[PDB]
């Protein structure tokens, strides 16, 4: 061992990620007559850990109906999921919220429902994500909407005001205008910009005010000059497959879970 | 250097659904083994699920007269919830056993004299006849009683179901109603007994079980 | 017999399903002067009643001209059919109906007009079913239509409420928002989720209440506000051909058909 | 000349053990067949003779004390006679026959704590010890319980009796009684629990069986 | 196993009638400078119980004389009582 670890007893390795497949198949009868030794064992040593649990007798358990196979990480996180939502009271204001797994940050501002719930099952996370959002009410609305990554100069999270930035400093960093006319709804990419390797929301303190971020996002609207109509918005998320995931956590406890 | 011979701690026993697991243990003491005792006590097959489910019984019975109407009912059984009863020793296969599966067979019989006339209609729908009319029951499965002719039937059936199996402690609602009808009404002579008896059998097919439990009781 | 059963006499099949096809087709003369035995037949043991009939000369009854062809099932079904409508008073409330095949359960409440009539044929139904909604009247109305398989906490059927459920709760159970503008007209494919083999509407009493359901759906709207301009709906169903259908039943009596 | 086909006036059924002869005759009316739906609902061995009855059962138990001498008598029990009775499952096998025949397996545990010291000793023995002395008990099938070392003790024996076969409602004589004596007292520490627990199990083997019949009800 | 046992641990026989004949004969020394290993075992599984005992140094015991042989069954019980 070039890493000089020394050893009489054998090392090994514990829980392996993807063990089995979710659904059940065939990748006979499994386990009778022959021994039912597995029964009985000690639970420390992962090598009597990885043995396989085997108690009475079995049969193998037949056959899934259906291909739509939905204990695959990616095909259950396809469905999108809740995000934010907030309403307008004026003409030509720009509101602003981060995305950040903060599981400190609690809801009105922070992540509520299922998402909350999700990322605190894994310490880390990278890759893009699919933003999406949805306009209510007044129409012939004009927004633009631009992504600003972390840290750089953004005004407040969780605001509805008017920004100081440059028109120009807005949009080169990219942006999408459209009209709540036509068509209402929008789906884009977020790309993964980030100085940091990966991102995570399990964090305390100094550093959830960082790593947890995975962004900002900032949306301002024009012409909405008449007070009346009720504009409101709805935000979505999902994550396709080229995000990848890493070293399971322990799930959040029950007072963990808030809703809107 | 031979060993001297070491005592074994830890052994598993098992069986059926059982298990054991023993820090006392031991090997096993057995005498003789089985055997055949070539003059045979009784040369019956001997008993097992084959033997006793798989037979008939006789079920339900009723008399049927002149006074009955057009296709009012004589009989209106239920298959399962009869069965499952304190008088039969197939009781006791069920009476422990939560979920069975199962086929069905069934015969019906009577005896019309021949001076006799009329008509009877078995008919084996699952549920109930709801609202269906009652004018094309003979699209179920089925067989016509006739007192000219055929004096009995023989239905059969395979199993229909919307859950997995049967469960007798809390049936949803009773697999097959037997449903019997006055097909064409008795006419009768004169002095003729004006009635006629009527029986019917059944037995399981396939019958499979799952889960032994003493909750029964 | 491995099953035990002992005979003398021949054992027979009978109702086997699909025996000929609808339309008229060669897939010579048909039968005269051979014989025409089996006119006269006795009607109970099956062997007997599965002679072919035959009474009189006749031709082989030329062709039918056109290959579409009406009688496979699909084919007719795949042709919708009237399910509910109704319609709404006010502003950011929900409606929910169920979707139950009880033949005990009548309309305005319950299946009217062909479909009941139509699924009292058959014991055994499964798989996939369409959906589709209408929409009517005033515009730029915005709604979400949840689906709720059956059993899980749903509010009331039949009514016209605000409901209870966190927003989440709804939304992640897979939705659609759309506007009354754009579109208004939606079709989507409801899936199969269910703890049942199967579904049956032929049920009385107890089992009726659960076995009956095929499930839910639920329809809320937003920024109605303005009283006027009378909202109202419909829906429509018809059966893809991954579904299947099992174990003919007898029809409904006259009296049992209602419509609206 | 083609003859018409002939009505079939007379046909013979049967199943299990069970016989009709019938004039009324027909041909049998199938739907469908057996099937094996590939989404299974339960995957246990199903049900049957070897599933049920070869199990085991909790039988007697009694705790055991200082106080006992030397071969007081701890355990007077018999196999037969306890497991026919409402408390089982097994016991609707039985009850719906007249004749049996089996070898019997038994399992005997007890759980000294080390401190403890003593040995108890478990013997098969058909009909009764009489006047067959004490002290030789070790003839027979057994296997000595030993607060040492073995905690549990496995016994298995063939069918031995006097007729063909045993039978429930009037025995003769129990087949096997069960004895288990004091085989060294019980000498304890001070503080230490002054008792111990002893259970027992049992299993038919090859368990056949014969005579069906309602009358044991 | 049709009759269904399980087991882990070897299932064996106790108590074999007629293990050995009653006339002492040869149906050589026995045992010694070999080992008597025998000698300290458990008494309960009878594995350990059948194993043959083995003590001290002996030898081979010799030859009955007569072959008249009083410990089969019959040969006792032929005389009446």
């Known amino acids: 061992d070039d890493s000089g670890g020394f050893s009489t007893t054998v090392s090994t390795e514990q829980n392996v990620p993807d063990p089995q497949v979710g659904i059940t198949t065939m990748r006979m009868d499994v386990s009778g007559v022959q021994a039912p030794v597995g029964a009985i064992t000690t639970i420390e040593d992962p090598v009597l850990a990885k043995k396989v649990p085997e108690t009475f007798p079995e049969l193998k358990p037949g056959e899934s109906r259906h291909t739509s196979d939905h204990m695959s990480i990616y095909k259950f996180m396809g469905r999108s999921h809740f995000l934010c939502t907030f309403t307008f009271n004026s003409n030509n204001k720009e509101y602003t919220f981060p995305i950040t797994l903060s599981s400190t940050s609690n809801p009105p501002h922070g992540l509520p429902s299922t998402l909350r719930w999700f990322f605190n099952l894994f310490q880390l996370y990278r890759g893009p994500l699919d933003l999406t959002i949805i306009i209510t009410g007044a129409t012939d609305v004009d927004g633009m909407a631009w992504f600003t990554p972390v840290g750089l100069a953004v005004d407040t999270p969780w605001v509805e005001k008017e920004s100081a930035l440059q028109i120009d400093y807005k949009t080169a960093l990219g942006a999408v205008r459209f009209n709540t006319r036509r068509t209402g709804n929008i789906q884009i990419r977020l790309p993964w910009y980030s100085y940091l390797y990966a991102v995570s929301g399990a964090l305390d303190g100094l550093g959830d005010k960082t790593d947890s971020t995975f962004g900002l996002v900032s949306i301002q609207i024009a012409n909405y000059n008449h007070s009346d109509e009720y504009l409101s918005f709805s935000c979505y998320l999902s994550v396709t497959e080229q995000s990848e995931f890493y070293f399971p956590r322990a799930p959040l406890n029950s007072n963990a879970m808030l809703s809107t | ?217």
């Open chain 2, 1 to 217: 250097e031979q060993m001297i011979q070491s005592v074994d701690r830890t052994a598993v026993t098992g069986a059926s659904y059982f298990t054991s697991v023993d820090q006392s243990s031991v090997h096993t003491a057995e005498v003789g083994s089985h055997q055949i005792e070539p003059l045979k006590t009784s040369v019956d097959k001997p008993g097992s699920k084959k033997t006793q489910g798989e037979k008939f019984f006789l079920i339900h019975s009723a008399r049927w007269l002149t006074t009955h109407a057009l296709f009012h009912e004589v009989a209106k059984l239920d298959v399962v919830k009869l069965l499952y009863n304190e008088q039969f020793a197939v009781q006791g296969l069920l009476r422990y056993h939560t979920y069975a599966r199962f086929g069905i067979e069934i015969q019906v019989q009577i005896n019309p004299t021949p001076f006799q006339q009329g008509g009877l209609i078995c008919a084996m729908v699952p549920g109930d006849q709801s609202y269906g009319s009652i004018a094309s029951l003979t699209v179920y499965p089925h067989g016509l009683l006739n007192c000219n002719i055929n004096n009995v039937v023989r239905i059969k059936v395979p199993f229909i179901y919307t859950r997995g199996a049967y469960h007798f402690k809390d049936p949803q609602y009773p697999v097959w109603e037997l449903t019997i009808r006055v097909w064409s009404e008795l006419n009768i002579g004169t002095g003729t007994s004006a009635y006629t008896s009527l029986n019917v059998l059944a037995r399981f097919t396939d019958l499979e079980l799952h889960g032994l439990t003493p909750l029964s009781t």
